[PDB]
Ligand binder design. Structure first.
Ligand SMILES: CC(=O)SCCNC(=O)CCNC(=O)[C@H](O)C(C)(C)COP(=O)(O)OP(=O)(O)OC[C@H]1O[C@@H](n2cnc3c(N)ncnc32)[C@H](O)[C@@H]1OP(=O)(O)O
Ligand SMILES: CC(=O)SCCNC(=O)CCNC(=O)[C@H](O)C(C)(C)COP(=O)(O)OP(=O)(O)OC[C@H]1O[C@@H](n2cnc3c(N)ncnc32)[C@H](O)[C@@H]1OP(=O)(O)O
Lengths: 153, 153
C-alpha cells in the first residue's frame, strides 16, 4: 500500500525529474535545460530546511509529491512574523488522480506550517490544481501583480 | 532638493516607523505591537542584502521609501534561477504624492533586480498602489491563492 515520507538529499535527482514532468504536464515549454538550477535549488533548500517535500510511494516508485517552502515577507499586523508557507511541486501520477492524494498532501503541508508557527499559506494555482485548492479553502487574491522585465521598460 | 540613498543599519528605526505609518495609511488595524518583529526583519534582511530599501529625503526628513526583497522560488523554464524581486514598503508623504516619486522609485528597484540577474518582479497592490503599478506594467495574476490557517480547517 501507499507509503508517505519526507524527501532526503538522496532523493534530489527524483525530485528534479518529477518537477520537470509536472511542469510539462502543466503545458510549459521545456525550452532550456534547467537541471543545474533545479538540483541546486533542492540541494540548498532541503539542506537548510527551507523546503519540505513529501512523497507518496508504492513499490518504491513515486506516485505523488507535494512541497512547502518557507518564505519571509515584511511583518504586518495580520501576520506578525511576516513568514508564509509557499506550496509547490505538487504532482500526482495521472492514473492515481481523483483519489484525494493531493488533498491529503495539503493536510500534511499545513501541518509543516503549524509546526513552524506559520499560519498564512500561498501558492500559484495551475489549471488542474485550482479546483483542488479552491475546494480546500484557498482564496482568490486580486492584489498580487507581476512585472516581467523582458516585457516592460 | 530631493536626495535619494539606500537605507543602512542606522536607518532601521525610521524604516520601522515609516512601515507602520504606511500600513495604517492603507487602512490596516494596528491591533498588536509588531515593533520587535519589524526591527528583526530589517536587521536580518538588510545585513544579508536580501532587502534593499531606497529612501528619498529632503532637509533630512524622509519623504518616500520603496523596497525590493529577493525571494527564492523553485526554478522553472521561464525563470531558470527561480528568484524574484518582491516590491514592498512603498510610501510617499501625502503632500508629495502625484509627482512621480513612487514611479521613479520603481525604476530604481527594477535596477536592483537587474544587477542581481533577476527579471521577474512581484508585489501585493494596495488601493493607492494599484493604478501606479498598473500604469507601470504590472499584470493581474489570477493564479495566486492564499489560505489562512486560522480560517479554514
Ligand atoms: C501549487 C502547485 O503545486 S500548482 C501545480 C499542481 N500540479 C499540476 O498541475 C500537475 C498536473 N496535475 C496533477 O498532478 C494533479 O491533477 C494535482 C496534483 C493537481 C491533483 O492531484 P489529485 O491527487 O488528483 O487531487 P485530488 O485527488 O485531491 O483532487 C482532485 C479531484 O478528485 C476529487 N476528489 C478527491 N478526493 C475525493 C473524495 N474523498 N470524494 C469525492 N471527490 C474527491 C476532487 O474533488 C477533484 O475533482 P473536482 O475538480 O471535480 O472537484
Ligand atoms: C507593493 C506595495 O508597496 S503596496 C503599498 C503602497 N503604499 C501605500 O499604499 C501607502 C499609501 N499610499 C502612498 O504612499 C502612495 O499613494 C504611493 C506610494 C502608492 C504612490 O506614491 P506616489 O509618489 O504618489 O506615486 P506617483 O506620483 O508615481 O503616481 C501616483 C499618481 O500621480 C500621477 N503621476 C506621477 N507622475 C506623473 C507624470 N509625470 N505625468 C502625469 N501624471 C503623473 C500618476 O499618473 C498617478 O495618478 P493616477 O492614479 O490618476 O494615474
Amino acid at each position: 500500500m501507499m507509503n508517505y515520507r519526507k524527501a532526503d538529499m538522496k532523493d534530489i535527482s527524483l525530485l528534479v525529474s518529477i518537477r520537470k514532468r509536472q511542469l510539462i504536464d502543466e503545458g510549459i515549454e521545456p525550452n532550456i535545460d534547467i537541471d543545474k538550477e533545479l538540483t541546486r535549488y533542492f540541494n540548498n533548500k532541503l539542506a537548510n530546511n527551507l523546503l519540505v517535500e513529501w512523497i507518496a510511494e508504492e513499490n518504491n516508485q513515486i506516485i505523488a509529491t507535494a512541497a512547502i517552502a518557507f518564505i519571509d515577507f515584511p511583518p504586518t499586523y495580520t501576520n506578525k512574523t511576516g513568514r508564509k508557507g509557499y506550496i509547490t511541486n505538487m504532482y500526482t501520477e495521472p492514473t492515481s488522480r481523483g483519489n484525494g492524494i493531493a488533498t491529503g498532501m495539503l493536510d500534511r503541508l499545513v501541518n509543516e506550517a503549524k509546526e513552524r508557527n506559520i499560519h498564512k499559506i500561498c501558492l500559484v494555482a495551475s489549471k488542474l490544481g485550482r479546483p483542488v485548492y479552491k475546494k480546500y479553502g484557498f482564496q482568490d487574491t486580486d492584489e498580487w501583480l507581476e512585472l516581467n522585465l523582458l516585457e516592460h521598460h
